[PDB]
């Protein structure tokens, strides 16, 4: 078996003359919770779609499950995205179909599963999102945060190995967005599914990640566990977090080797 | 009576009033024991997944139906063996009292 579901290794990027990514390298461990953050505009949910395949890099490897995507052949690539699944933010919603339709036809035309046990899959996954009583409502008759919350049923429908979110929580008062939290992490809990999630809702996808990355400046510029990032002292690290720059380090006082102060001598 | 079913990745068996499951209860493997449900829920009490490695959403909502036309005959089901990770699934969604027994 391989450990990181995904190994990015000196991956760089470039769109027209501007530079998008520079030698980055960062790993998704499998079945665990990896998040992903950083100022707006400085292509995370590029990343996403490095990662998917759908773009590709310009130098470096994109290893999915031991696999380098960029030198797959497209047969190869289209059977191993259905390991997959991607949560834009542009993405939209068929306006033709409900919103029960709308997260069933995932499962219709992959799952090839009997129409009792669909429905009641529908019913439960529109239950983890809150619009169980939102199912006959077209696309047009939902509000903001209740159309993100329908995109987010249907790409959580079939489960597959990696599930990709950007920014899962946007739009959402925030006992919705605990509710949501809840979801990935629970989703990650049962199923083992390997959860990427891009967001700038920091405390919250922090509660659940067991890895973190922080990108500026086109690369990477920290990672670790939240309480690693609280006693970072890295001006851009800090100047994200706190929102403001040339602030206290929360966690004033940094910590030891871990393996030291656990196994000492 | 006593009742057994193997395949590839699930297996299911019978004895007297206790439908006992092995393997993957997965939506790919799972249609087998959707096709015979009612006689793999004649007069059974208790539904035993201790050798179930994962259960996915709709292994789950088998379950429910399982559960569901099994006490349709009279017969109140306890569930055995289950591991704690069907659980959080259950959670997930919000499971009622009286569609699954805790």
Known sequence: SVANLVDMRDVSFTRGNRCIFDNISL??????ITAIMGPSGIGKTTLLRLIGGQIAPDHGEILFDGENIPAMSRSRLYTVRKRMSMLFQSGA?????????????????????????????????????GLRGAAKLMPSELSGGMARRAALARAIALEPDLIM?????????????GVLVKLISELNSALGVTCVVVSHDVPEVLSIADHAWILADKKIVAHGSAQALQANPDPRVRQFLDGIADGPV???????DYHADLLPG | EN????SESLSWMQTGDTLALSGELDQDVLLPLWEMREEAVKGITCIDLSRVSRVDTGGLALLLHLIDLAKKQGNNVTLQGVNDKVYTLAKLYNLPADVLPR
């Open chain 1, 250 to 256: 929360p966690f004033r006082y940094p910590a030891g």
């Open chain 1, 93 to 129: 919603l068929f306006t033709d179909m409900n919103v029960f339709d709308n997260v069933a036809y995932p499962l219709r035309e992959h799952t090839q599963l009997p129409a009792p046990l669909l429905h009641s899959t529908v019913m439960m996954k529109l239950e983890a999102v």
């Open chain 1, 27 to 32: 790993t998704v461990p499998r079945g665990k």
């Open chain 2, 3 to 6: 009742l057994y079913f193997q």
């Open chain 1, 165 to 177: 979110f950007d920014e899962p929580f946007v739009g959402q008062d925030p006992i919705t967005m």
